Design a protein around this motif. Structure first.
Motif, PDB file in Angstrom:
ATOM      1  N   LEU A  45       0.781  -1.225   0.000  1.00  0.00           N
ATOM      2  CA  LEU A  45       0.000   0.000   0.000  1.00  0.00           C
ATOM      3  C   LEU A  45       0.822   1.289   0.000  1.00  0.00           C
ATOM      4  N   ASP A  46       1.983   1.280   0.690  1.00  0.00           N
ATOM      5  CA  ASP A  46       2.922   2.419   0.703  1.00  0.00           C
ATOM      6  C   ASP A  46       3.452   2.763  -0.703  1.00  0.00           C
ATOM      7  N   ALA A  47       3.806   1.755  -1.499  1.00  0.00           N
ATOM      8  CA  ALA A  47       4.207   2.001  -2.869  1.00  0.00           C
ATOM      9  C   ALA A  47       3.019   2.425  -3.751  1.00  0.00           C
ATOM     10  N   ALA A  48       1.866   1.766  -3.602  1.00  0.00           N
ATOM     11  CA  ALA A  48       0.675   2.167  -4.355  1.00  0.00           C
ATOM     12  C   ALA A  48       0.295   3.637  -4.115  1.00  0.00           C
ATOM     13  N   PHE A  49       0.510   4.144  -2.905  1.00  0.00           N
ATOM     14  CA  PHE A  49       0.210   5.548  -2.603  1.00  0.00           C
ATOM     15  C   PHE A  49       1.425   6.446  -2.407  1.00  0.00           C
ATOM     16  N   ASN A  50       2.561   6.105  -3.015  1.00  0.00           N
ATOM     17  CA  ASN A  50       3.766   6.963  -2.966  1.00  0.00           C
ATOM     18  C   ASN A  50       4.299   7.319  -1.565  1.00  0.00           C
ATOM     19  N   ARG A  51       3.942   6.532  -0.542  1.00  0.00           N
ATOM     20  CA  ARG A  51       4.321   6.890   0.842  1.00  0.00           C
ATOM     21  C   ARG A  51       5.628   6.253   1.246  1.00  0.00           C
ATOM     22  N   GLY A  52       6.063   5.252   0.515  1.00  0.00           N
ATOM     23  CA  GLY A  52       7.291   4.538   0.838  1.00  0.00           C
ATOM     24  C   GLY A  52       7.355   3.259   0.028  1.00  0.00           C
ATOM     25  N   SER A  53       8.016   2.240   0.575  1.00  0.00           N
ATOM     26  CA  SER A  53       8.066   0.915  -0.036  1.00  0.00           C
ATOM     27  C   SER A  53       8.320  -0.183   1.036  1.00  0.00           C
ATOM     28  N   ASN A  54       7.780  -1.382   0.834  1.00  0.00           N
ATOM     29  CA  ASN A  54       7.991  -2.493   1.779  1.00  0.00           C
ATOM     30  C   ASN A  54       8.724  -3.660   1.089  1.00  0.00           C
ATOM     31  N   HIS A  55       9.572  -3.327   0.121  1.00  0.00           N
ATOM     32  CA  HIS A  55      10.153  -4.347  -0.748  1.00  0.00           C
ATOM     33  C   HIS A  55      11.038  -5.318   0.027  1.00  0.00           C
ATOM     34  N   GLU A  56      11.776  -4.808   1.019  1.00  0.00           N
ATOM     35  CA  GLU A  56      12.740  -5.652   1.729  1.00  0.00           C
ATOM     36  C   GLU A  56      12.083  -6.603   2.660  1.00  0.00           C
ATOM     37  N   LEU A  57      10.947  -6.210   3.228  1.00  0.00           N
ATOM     38  CA  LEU A  57      10.106  -7.147   3.991  1.00  0.00           C
ATOM     39  C   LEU A  57       9.489  -8.224   3.107  1.00  0.00           C
ATOM     40  N   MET A  58       9.089  -7.835   1.891  1.00  0.00           N
ATOM     41  CA  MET A  58       8.605  -8.835   0.921  1.00  0.00           C
ATOM     42  C   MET A  58       9.722  -9.850   0.608  1.00  0.00           C
ATOM     43  N   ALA A  59      10.944  -9.353   0.364  1.00  0.00           N
ATOM     44  CA  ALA A  59      12.040 -10.232  -0.032  1.00  0.00           C
ATOM     45  C   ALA A  59      12.316 -11.177   1.116  1.00  0.00           C
ATOM     46  N   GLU A  60      12.077 -10.731   2.351  1.00  0.00           N
ATOM     47  CA  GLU A  60      12.254 -11.589   3.511  1.00  0.00           C
ATOM     48  C   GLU A  60      11.242 -12.691   3.536  1.00  0.00           C
ATOM     49  N   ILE A  61      10.012 -12.371   3.142  1.00  0.00           N
ATOM     50  CA  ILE A  61       8.961 -13.390   3.084  1.00  0.00           C
ATOM     51  C   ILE A  61       9.240 -14.472   2.051  1.00  0.00           C
ATOM     52  N   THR A  62       9.694 -14.062   0.863  1.00  0.00           N
ATOM     53  CA  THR A  62      10.006 -15.062  -0.161  1.00  0.00           C
ATOM     54  C   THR A  62      11.258 -15.857   0.205  1.00  0.00           C
ATOM     55  N   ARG A  63      12.242 -15.189   0.820  1.00  0.00           N
ATOM     56  CA  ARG A  63      13.393 -15.887   1.380  1.00  0.00           C
ATOM     57  C   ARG A  63      12.952 -16.948   2.397  1.00  0.00           C
ATOM     58  N   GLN A  64      12.140 -16.565   3.391  1.00  0.00           N
ATOM     59  CA  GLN A  64      11.819 -17.456   4.517  1.00  0.00           C
ATOM     60  C   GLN A  64      10.773 -18.555   4.253  1.00  0.00           C
ATOM     61  N   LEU A  65       9.875 -18.323   3.295  1.00  0.00           N
ATOM     62  CA  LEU A  65       8.763 -19.254   3.053  1.00  0.00           C
ATOM     63  C   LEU A  65       8.778 -19.786   1.629  1.00  0.00           C
ATOM     64  N   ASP A  66       8.309 -21.008   1.434  1.00  0.00           N
ATOM     65  CA  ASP A  66       8.262 -21.575   0.089  1.00  0.00           C
ATOM     66  C   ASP A  66       6.804 -21.532  -0.391  1.00  0.00           C
ATOM     67  N   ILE A  67       6.261 -20.324  -0.562  1.00  0.00           N
ATOM     68  CA  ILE A  67       4.861 -20.113  -0.999  1.00  0.00           C
ATOM     69  C   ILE A  67       4.870 -19.212  -2.196  1.00  0.00           C
ATOM     70  N   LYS A  68       3.956 -19.418  -3.141  1.00  0.00           N
ATOM     71  CA  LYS A  68       3.892 -18.525  -4.306  1.00  0.00           C
ATOM     72  C   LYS A  68       3.314 -17.157  -3.889  1.00  0.00           C
ATOM     73  N   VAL A  69       3.921 -16.070  -4.366  1.00  0.00           N
ATOM     74  CA  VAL A  69       3.536 -14.717  -3.944  1.00  0.00           C
ATOM     75  C   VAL A  69       3.175 -13.914  -5.192  1.00  0.00           C
ATOM     76  N   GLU A  70       1.934 -13.413  -5.243  1.00  0.00           N
ATOM     77  CA  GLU A  70       1.596 -12.379  -6.221  1.00  0.00           C
ATOM     78  C   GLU A  70       1.771 -11.023  -5.533  1.00  0.00           C
ATOM     79  N   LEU A  71       2.458 -10.095  -6.188  1.00  0.00           N
ATOM     80  CA  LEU A  71       2.753  -8.824  -5.565  1.00  0.00           C
ATOM     81  C   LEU A  71       2.288  -7.641  -6.386  1.00  0.00           C
ATOM     82  N   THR A  72       1.568  -6.742  -5.761  1.00  0.00           N
ATOM     83  CA  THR A  72       1.101  -5.584  -6.492  1.00  0.00           C
ATOM     84  C   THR A  72       1.278  -4.304  -5.663  1.00  0.00           C
ATOM     85  N   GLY A  73       1.170  -3.154  -6.325  1.00  0.00           N
ATOM     86  CA  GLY A  73       1.179  -1.867  -5.634  1.00  0.00           C
ATOM     87  C   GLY A  73       2.296  -0.948  -6.107  1.00  0.00           C
ATOM     88  N   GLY A  74       1.926   0.052  -6.906  1.00  0.00           N
ATOM     89  CA  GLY A  74       2.870   1.061  -7.407  1.00  0.00           C
ATOM     90  C   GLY A  74       3.847   0.671  -8.511  1.00  0.00           C
TER      91      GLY A  74
END
Length: 235
Positions: A45-74
């Motif tokens: 939501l931060d990227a979708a609304f120009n307020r910031g980005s949560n990319h590194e937390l996302m990369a942590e999720i894909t690193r830590q879990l073996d689940i398929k991730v669809e990612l959207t926003g900005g």
């Protein structure tokens, strides 16, 4: 609705807790994986609304879990797309920018293929389906162009169903499924378990997925319940 994707809206590093308040996206993901979740839909939501980005937390999720991730926003230029991809997302969705940059989007479909879904928000007005873009045009011309450019997947949203207890607009979705060879993700308006089931009925026409937020977090049904109920149809 072959496959179901629970939605996780991230802001300032947090997402809505599935209760019985807010915690980490990881916790949400773990809590959803527990329940048979094979795919997760993440909104930055931060990227979708120009307020910031949560990319590194996302990369942590894909690193830590073996689940398929669809990612959207900005995702709107090459710089944002890169940073979306750098996350390890299985798939990324591009919304408004896709209609406003027809050559850029062809270019990205060319390089990325199946990593790209295009998210199309539509509004019915004066009897015609218009891409509620930023407008973006006629829905049917947009689809034909995108299809012709090799788009692998569409995410379609009737911009009214967000109020949840109408139902998703199945007649539109079936029309869209018939208009393109690309498979369709229904998004927007899930109210009841039977809404999921009305969709899965049409999985063979090309409606193979549904994104679900509110209905899940407001405990209308559980994920395990819906996954089994969709199994029961399979047979």
């Amino acid at each position: 609705t072959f496959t179901i994707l629970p939605a996780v809206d991230v802001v300032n590093g947090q997402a809505v807790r599935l209760d019985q308040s807010y915690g980490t996206p990881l916790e949400s993901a773990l809590r959803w994986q527990e329940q048979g979740a094979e795919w997760l839909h993440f909104v930055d939501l931060d990227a979708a609304f120009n307020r910031g980005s949560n990319h590194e937390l996302m990369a942590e999720i894909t690193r830590q879990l073996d689940i398929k991730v669809e990612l959207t926003g900005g995702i709107r230029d090459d710089a944002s797309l890169e940073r979306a991809l750098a996350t390890g997302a299985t798939r990324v969705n591009i919304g408004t920018a896709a209609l406003e940059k027809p050559e850029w989007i062809a270019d990205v479909i060319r390089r990325h293929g199946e990593k790209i879904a295009v998210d199309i928000a539509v509004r019915l007005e004066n009897g015609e389906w218009r891409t509620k873009g930023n407008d973006g045009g006629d829905l049917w011309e947009v689809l034909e162009r995108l299809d012709s450019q090799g788009c692998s997947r569409f995410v379609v949203t009737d911009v009214s169903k967000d109020g949840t207890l109408t139902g998703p607009n199945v007649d539109l979705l079936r029309d869209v499924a018939a208009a393109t060879d690309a498979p369709i993700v229904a998004s927007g308006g899930i109210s009841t378990l039977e809404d999921v089931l009305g969709l899965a009925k049409y999985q063979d026409e090309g409606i193979d997925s549904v994104i679900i937020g509110k209905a899940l977090y407001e405990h209308r049904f559980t994920l395990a319940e819906a996954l089994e109920a969709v199994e029961k149809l399979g047979k």
